[PDB]
A paper describes a structure:
The top spheric cap is a complex of pIX, pVII, and pVIII. The five pVII molecules form a symmetric plug-like pentamer that are located at the top middle of the cap. The five pVIIs mainly interact with each other through hydrophobic residues, including F7, I10, A13, M14, L21, A24, L25, and A29. The 5 pIX molecules of the protein layer 2 assemble around the pVII pentamer. Interactions between pIX and pVII mainly involve hydrophobic interactions, hydrogen bonds, and salt bridges. The molecules from the first layer of pVIII (layer 3) are inserted in between the pIX molecules and have a completely different contact environment compared to the pVIII molecules from other layers. The bent angle (~34° from the main axis of the virion) of the pVIII in layer 3 is significantly larger than those (~21°) of the pVIIIs in layers 4–5 and the middle part of the particle, due to the specific environment of pVIII molecules in the layer for establishing interactions with pIX and pVII. The cap constituted by pVII, pIX, and pVIII has a unique lumen that is decorated with four positively charged residues, including R33 of pVII, K40, K43, K48 of pVIII and one negatively charged residue, E29 of pIX. Among these, residues R33 of pVII and E29 of pIX are in proximity to the encapsidated DNA genome, indicating that these residues could be involved in direct interactions and specific recognition of the genome packaging signal, which was supposed to have a hairpin structure. Further mutagenesis studies of residues E29 of pIX and R33 of pVII showed that these residues are essential for the assembly of living viruses.
Numbering used by the authors:
A (entry chain F), E (entry chain IA), I (entry chain BA), N (entry chain L), O (entry chain S): 5 to 33
B (entry chain A), F (entry chain Z), G (entry chain E), J (entry chain C), K (entry chain HA), L (entry chain G), ...: 5 to 50
C (entry chain J), D (entry chain D), H (entry chain GA), S (entry chain Y), W (entry chain Q): 1 to 32
């Protein structure tokens, strides 16, 4: 819709991907 | 900061996920180590 | 740098939460 | 926050579906 | 094509990536 | 919500994938544990 | 939580799997110890 | 929903192709 | 260049990432 | 439930193996004990 | 499902691999138990 | 608890095996001592 | 704390197994020692 | 907001994802 | 800055992510 | 559909990659299991 | 550091887990060595 | 109970061996005692 | 299809380079 | 079932080994008892 | 202390066996010595 | 370069993360290897 | 090429930092 | 240190077992030597 | 099919190893049994 | 092609990374297998 | 295929690694079996 | 350097365990050897 | 290379870790072989 | 059947050893009996 | 095939060990039988 | 080629270990055999 | 050197046992020889 | 090389143990042969 | 060939022990036979 809309959505997607990668990295024994 | 708001929302969501994982981890490890201790001590009694 | 700092904080949070499970499971397993 | 909530729900759904396989396989393996 | 087009596509890509990362994280014994 | 619609579509797709995985997992584990139990019990008969 | 239903399903599935494991452990350990004790006692009994 | 359906199909295709290698290797290994 | 250009490129990047995540998930014994 | 089918198949496999194993244990143990008792008594009587 | 063909191929491939495994298990276990029993009986037979 | 039930069963199975073993010991020892005393006392008297 | 609950449950499981194991050890050891001492003294006295 | 805003944010997201993938790759024994 | 700028940057980010996922997939024993 | 075209191109690329992996997997597993079977059977001959 | 609190929590949790492990190790090792020594000494003591 | 049948068959075989050992020992003892008495009586007579 | 072909080539290159390390380490380990 | 066929083959292989073993035992025991009785009876008679 | 009770019970059983062995050895020694003295005295008298 | 600035910020953040990991790794490995060395040396004393 | 060079440098930095932990843990484990 | 406390306890547990073992040895050896000397000296004197 | 080629190569490798192993078993077993029988008979005859 | 240029730059960067990995892999595996071979051969000398 | 060169390099590298593995396996297995047979034969040879 | 601290702590742990283990080895070995020598000489002297 | 410094640090860190490993291996193997040889020689020395 | 040939060869070697043992025992018994009879007859004659 | 060459070498190494072992057996057995017959025949003749 | 360097270093390490191991085997085996032969002959001669 | 002290203590305990064995053997031999000489001398005198 | 130094130390530690062992053997064997010859020669002379 | 040298040294040591055993057995046999002949001749003369 608007540039701000894309910006805010992209930021929220980034933090949730970084958390998932964090879980995968932490679960490596 | 938009990133700050996203991180704060993630913190609340994370506590739900780690609460779920903990409730499963406890029961599963209570079962696997109990069947491991069972097999070990039976064979030790021999 | 704001999105980098908060995205990195998210990664460290995820490692810290899961590592608590990994360490508990590993210690108890080798304990028995 | 909508896309964060639904993207996180997708991650938890994926963990829950696969974890059911992992637990079943591990329990049965150490059972024998 | 349109901003809305990019926005909707990006959201659908995000949920399918988060599910795949979820499978990888859950399959760690 | 566009995210809600995407998640609902993913839920339906997920049930297909987990149904596929389950149908393979069952057969594979039925074979591996059976060859493990076979080798174990033959050696126990000794 | 949109995925609370998935966690609830996993929880009800896990308690079923633990019951399955304990049942199979008891039968395998029972046969293993039984065969081992039989061989030991018959040799001691000359 | 088109990009979701085709992206998900790509994930399932990848799992199916690699899982064939994993199962073959595991079965043959425990077979010997 | 054009919105359509970005849209098509993003879709092709998405399928190739999902395949790679699929290989990683399938290779977990 | 694919999980129940997997457990049932493995439980049946285990039961078959236990039966076959016990049969072979009896035959092999009988031979070993028979040879030992024969050599012991033949020397006492002679 | 665009990847249903891939699952169908994996299913037909898996049943072939299980047959391969059982064939190799039988030959390896057969030789192992055979050699072990041969050594055991020859020692008992003096 | 499946553990307690299994442990009690393995103890009862051991107890019954001990009963069978002692019966066999008495039979073998009785013949052994009997033959030895027979040869000894016959030589001493005659 | 779910971690404390997991540790407490496993500590209780271990304590139960140790008690049951020690009981079975005493019974099995008693039988083995009893058979050996019986065979030794019966030959010395005879 | 602005194209430059999206560009700078995307670059910062990329380096933090590459570091996380680096940790996962390095933790494979 | 420009659409072409975003396009070129996105392509370079994609190849470096695919290489990292390739290392993770190849390191699975 | 742009996504359909991308998926169809990926299908062709995937067959190349899985063909490469298979040609390496076969040779590698032929070597590792052969050195495993070698070490096992030499030690069994003893 | 926004996630310093998470690290601090993990640090206080880890020292608790190490205490749990050492407690369970001591009890399992104690019973294992005790049973093994009991069997060894009773056999040596005839 | 496969073990019960096996123990009973082993004890039945043991009883069979004793029956044969006692028959042979009577013959051997009779022969040696006969020679001793014959030589003793003839020497005393002459 | 250009970005798909080159992105896929990058994935295959990464697998090939790392797989050489994995195979060498595994073979030498089981060799001893 | 490949399992059943293999188990029956391993039991038949054990049975034939027992037959060969018993033949060897008879030959060795026969010579042992024969030599002992020969030396004993020769001394008793002459 | 389960081990202390077990050791005490084993020593009590051992003392029981000695009591029986000494009773039997007195009877056997008395019988053989009696026959020897009887034959010796009668020979000296005549 | 915007990428240069992002990488330089990441370098500083990385040193924090690797400092956290190191402080946890040291304590955890000090505990696991100590319980491994403990169990090993106790069993070696035997 | 700037974003590729710096993104690749980030990946190598991450591998180097974590690999130091992996090697230390593995060596000490097999050492005992 | 939990390690030191456990090691001292395992050493004390071994020490008490050695005490129990030596008591049993004296009882068994005393009866064995006593019976042997009894039969020997009775024959030598009478 | 690369999978069939892999299975066939491993099946051939296993067959070769089994043949070579059985040959070495016969030679080593023959030497061990030959030495034992030689030492036994040479003492009986002497 | 912009993608072609990116891939060509990645190829050069990849050779640096795989050169780094190889230089570390060689030294690490030279150490781990040497401590594995050391522990194995010392215990074999026994 | 832009990465066909990488696959070709891996293929030529893999066949070299397999040769390296077989060479090291033969030398380690040779020494292991040699030492084991030496100890076995010297004990049998008295 | 956190790595040096980890190595130093583990080196200290190992040194303590070796000292405690050697002490327990001496006590347990002394008892076993003492019982064996006692039983050997008491029979030679008697 | 912006991360060449990180590789150089890892290289200087790796050579330090290898030295740490060899030091700990020598002390653990030394104690293990020493205790094992002590028990072996004392038993052979009677 | 490699085992059948091996068992037959072992029994053939066993029969060979008996042939030699019987030859030697005849010579040894003949010599000792001859000396005994010679001394006895000469003493009776004178 | 490196496997075939290694298997043939291990068989030849076993064959040469058997040759060395038999030489040692003859020397030891010759002295043992010689000393025994020397003491026996000397007593019989003188 | 870093791979060749790694193989060469490990091949050299293995060769050194085999040489050192064989030397220690000879010394330890010589002592064990020497003690056994000494105790055997000293009893035959005495 | 913990081993040196342990070996010295074991040898000191061994020397203690010999001191006691020699004392007892003198008493037993003196008693039996005394009875033999007494009976012999009295018979010769009368 | 830490390996070479450790291997030389383990060989020297074995050598010193052999020295201690031989000293103990001489003491035990000397008493054993001495007591046996004492009882034998006393009976032969008186 | 390290094994060849070791076997030769063991056989050389064995031959040394025989040389000493034969020397001692000549002395012991000479002494006992001398006492027997002396007593026999003196009794016949008187």
């Amino acid at each position: 819709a608007d540039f701000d809309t894309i910006y805010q959505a992209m930021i929220q997607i980034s933090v949730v991907l970084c958390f998932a990668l964090g879980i995968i990295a932490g679960g490596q024994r | 900061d938009p990133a700050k708001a996203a991180f704060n929302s993630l913190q609340a969501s994370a506590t739900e996920y780690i609460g779920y994982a903990w409730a499963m981890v406890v029961v599963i490890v209570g079962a696997t180590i109990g069947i491991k201790l069972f097999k070990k001590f039976t064979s030790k009694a021999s | 740098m704001s999105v980098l700092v908060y995205s990195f904080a998210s990664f460290v949070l995820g490692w810290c939460l899961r590592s608590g499970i990994t360490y508990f499971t590993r210690l108890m397993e080798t304990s028995s």
